[PDB]
Amino acid sequence: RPGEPVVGTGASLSVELGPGLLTSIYDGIQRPLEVIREKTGDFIARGVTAPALPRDKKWHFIPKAKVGDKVVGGDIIGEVPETSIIVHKIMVPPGIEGEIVEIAEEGDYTIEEVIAKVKTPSGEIKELKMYQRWPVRVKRPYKEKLPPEVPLITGQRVIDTFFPQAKGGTAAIPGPFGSGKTVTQHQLAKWSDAQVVIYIGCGERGNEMTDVLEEFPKLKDPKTGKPLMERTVLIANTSNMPVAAREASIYTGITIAEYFRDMGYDVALMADSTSRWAEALPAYLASKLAEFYERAGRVVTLGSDYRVGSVSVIGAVSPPGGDFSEPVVQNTLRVVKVFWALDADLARRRHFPAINWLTSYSLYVDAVKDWWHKNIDPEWKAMRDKAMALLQKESELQEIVRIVGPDALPERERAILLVARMLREDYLQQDAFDEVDTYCPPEKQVTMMRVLLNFYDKTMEAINRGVPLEEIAKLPVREEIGRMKFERDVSKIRSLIDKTNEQFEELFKKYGA
DSSP: OOOOOOOSSOOOOEEEESTTOTTOEEETTSOOSSOOOOBOOSSOOBOOOOOSSOSSOOEEEEEOOOTTOEEOTTOEEEEEEOSSSOEEEEEOOTTOOEEEEEEOOSEEEOTTSOOEEEEOTTSOEEEEOSOEEEETTSOOOOSEEEOSOSBOOOSOHIIIIISOOBTTOEEEEESOTTOTTOOHHHHHHHHSSOSEEEEEOOSOOTTTTHHHHSSGGGOBOTTTSSBGGGGEEEEEOOTTSOHHHHHHHHHHHHHHHHHHHHTTOEEEEEEOOOSSOOOOOOOHHHHHHHHHHTTOEEEEOSSSSOOEEEEEEEEEEOOSSSOOOTTHHHHHHHHOSEEOOBOHHHHHTTOSSOBOTTTOEETTHHHHHHHHHHHTOTTHHHHHHHHHHHHHHHHHHHHHHHHHOSTTOOHHHHHHHHHHHHHIIIIIOOOTTSTTTTSOOHHHHHHHHHHHHHHHHHHHHHHTTTOOHHHHHTOTHHHHHTTGGGOOOHHHHHTHHHHHHHHHHHHHHSOOO
C-alpha cells in the first residue's frame, strides 16, 4: 500500500526528509520498525503499510525568509527545533527556485501543511512543506565536492594521529559493531565531531535488535548530556527482513545523511555488517558498492549563502570468517581511503583500542596535516611520522629478538624498545572507560606526543653520552608520562617536557649509574 506507480527501471523508492527523522527507527525502505515487508528485483519493487514522518506531531516553525525573497534549491526558509540538540533546517527542495510569494508565520504545524509558496520564473506556483521526498537511488545535488581537507576529530589518539578520517571520507573497520571485543565502534559514534549520526545497525541477530531497541534510547550524548538518539537516525536490518530492504538500507541512510549535510551539518554514516550483506538488486556488485561510497564527501551545498556540509562513512567489514576476501572486505578495502584494523591478538593482550598500527592505513594524512599545522601544532605531521618510524623500528627489532634473543641488544636498541613501549602504553592505548581519557582533545594529543618525542630525543642523547639505559628506564618522570593520558589540564602535561629535561640533567650530573 502507501501509494506509488510508474514504468522505467525503478518504481521510485523514495524517502521523506523533514522534521521527525531524529530518534526515529526505520528499516531498509524507511518506515517505523517492526513493519511488513518489501520486494525487489533487478527491475523495480513493492511495499505494504506504515508512515515515515508523524502526521500528527506538531513542530514549531520559525520563518527565516520574507515574502518577495528570491530563493533557489537548498535555500533555508525556516527552522524547526526537532529535539533539544538539533535544529532542523527547512530547505527549498532541489530543482525549485523563484520568488517567495507566501510564507507561514512563527507557529505550530504538522508536516503535510504548507508553510510557503514559490512563484517560479515560468510563473508556476510551487507549494512547500517542512518535508520533501527524494529517490534514495539518486545522489542528492550539491554545488561542489571539496577535496579532503578537514579531519573528522575522533578524540581517539591512534586514529586522529596515525590513521586520520577526513570529514567526508570513507573508512572501513572489522567485524560487527555489536561485537563486544572492542568498543571503538561506539566511541566513534558519540565523540566524532559530526552533529548528526546515521546508524545502519545492520547485521543484527539472536537479540542484537532488542539489544539496541531499548538500550540506545538511554545512551547519552557526551557533549550535551542528552540522549544520543536525539541526534541519531537508526536503520535496522534484521534476519526476518527481506534481502531487498537490507539492500536498500544503505541507500535510504546515505540519502538521509546527504539531506542533513545539505543543511550545513557534518554527519557520520555508520554501516554495520555481518555475513552476506545481501542478495537483492563478483562483478557488477563491485560497481554498486563503489557507487555507494562515492556519495561520501564534504560539499558546498545548494543554496544562495555558501554553505558546507559533509557525510563521512564508516563501514563494518565482516568476511565469511577470517578469510577476509569476498564479499565485504576485498571490494571495500579497494574503495575506502581509511582502514582501522581491530586485531584479536591486540585485544587478547588487552591493548586498547585494539587497532593494529602496522596494518591500518589512512590515505588522508597529507590531506589533513595542514588543518593540524595551522590550528593545533606546526609539527603534527613530523611528529606522527617520527612516532610511526619508532613503532616500525620496534616491529623489526622484535622480529629479530624473536630469533636471536634480547641479550645481545646494544644500549641504543634497548632505548628504542623502551621509548617504543612508552608510545604504545602512554599514547596508542586509550581508556574508553575513564571519564578523562575517553576523549582526547586535539590540543592534548600533540602535547602528549611532544612529551614522548622529547623523552626520546633526550634518551638517545643521554645514551650517546654513556648514560646507562637502566638509569633512564627508572627516571622518575616516566611514571608521570604514563599517567599523562589521565590528566585533564594540558598545561600540566606540557610541563613534563621541562621536568624531563632537568631530570636528564641530574643524570648528566651524576654522569651514570
